[PDB]
Symmetry: C2
């Protein structure tokens, strides 16, 4: 149910034209839908502490996730919950107990002030690339849609070089 | 239960500090929560067509609202709907019939493709000012929260000059 991980992930915004070209370049055909239900306090506490708190619905699975700062990249705490647990967090704004609650209290978020603020649909595809994972994200936000390429790595120094090299190969500007 | 209006909107991004100062100038203390549930097709048809479709939930009310191009600004169509109707649209992706559906057909949006794509919360206060409605918004998006000032008017020329003069009066730079 419960895992934690250190995630090192570079991200670049891209245009629609660049996105479609890069997807054809990697033979990216199939996209997987996911929806993220995000939480925050009226004072933006999560954001102020470099952190994010979300319930991801992907397939039949719901996962409560906290991302927070680590020395390198982010420390992520995932907790699989049931649909009904997901819906009660969203309708009551009370966060279920367990690893994610434990980390929020140690971060000193005023947990009782957290509220369900909204949601976003992302279409996501991935592929293994230079011993990292290349991610193609198309997200539908309130008045606009956003295209991103991401790269999750094991080595921050060599991963970065590989990512910047890829962008350069494809004449994609660093954004 | 249904209205249409031609609407002209000016918007400026402000800092929290600018936002609180402008609020204090207008005796704005109370904010009202509002949630917008938005729809779009996989092809982004609505965005292509300069348009937006949302269900807004505020207070007791759900309002299905379509925004589309007018010769200047936007033609808004509003249709008040029931909780059940709102939920049905969000769960099944089917747009209820009436004035908003009729406008979507005229736009040639592939209506059967529209899907419920997400939602966002906004804390809002409005005051009547010069030719219109001055809006103070604090919105909570996925990655971040923003403060924005908007001005909704019917007269473009004078509306724009008044909004610009108000921003300079308070040393707020133009950020589109």
């Amino acid at each position: 149910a419960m895992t934690q991980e250190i995630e090192i992930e570079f991200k670049n915004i891209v245009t629609e034209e660049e996105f479609h070209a890069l997807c054809k370049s990697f033979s990216i055909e199939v996209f997987t839908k996911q929806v993220n239900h995000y939480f925050e306090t009226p004072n933006s506490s999560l954001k102020e502490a470099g952190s994010a708190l979300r319930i991801r619905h992907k397939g039949e699975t719901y996962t409560l996730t906290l991302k927070q700062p680590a020395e390198v990249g982010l420390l992520e705490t995932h907790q699989v919950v049931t649909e009904n647990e997901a819906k009660m967090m969203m309708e009551t704004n009370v966060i279920i107990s367990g690893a994610v609650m434990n980390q929020l209290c140690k971060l000193q978020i005023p947990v009782s002030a957290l509220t369900y603020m909204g949601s976003l649909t992302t279409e996501r595809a991935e592929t293994l690339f230079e011993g990292g994972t290349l991610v193609f994200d198309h997200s539908f936000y309130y008045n606009h849609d956003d295209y991103e390429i991401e790269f999750e790595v094991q080595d921050e120094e060599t991963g970065k070089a590989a990512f910047i090299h890829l962008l350069k190969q494809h004449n994609i500007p660093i954004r």
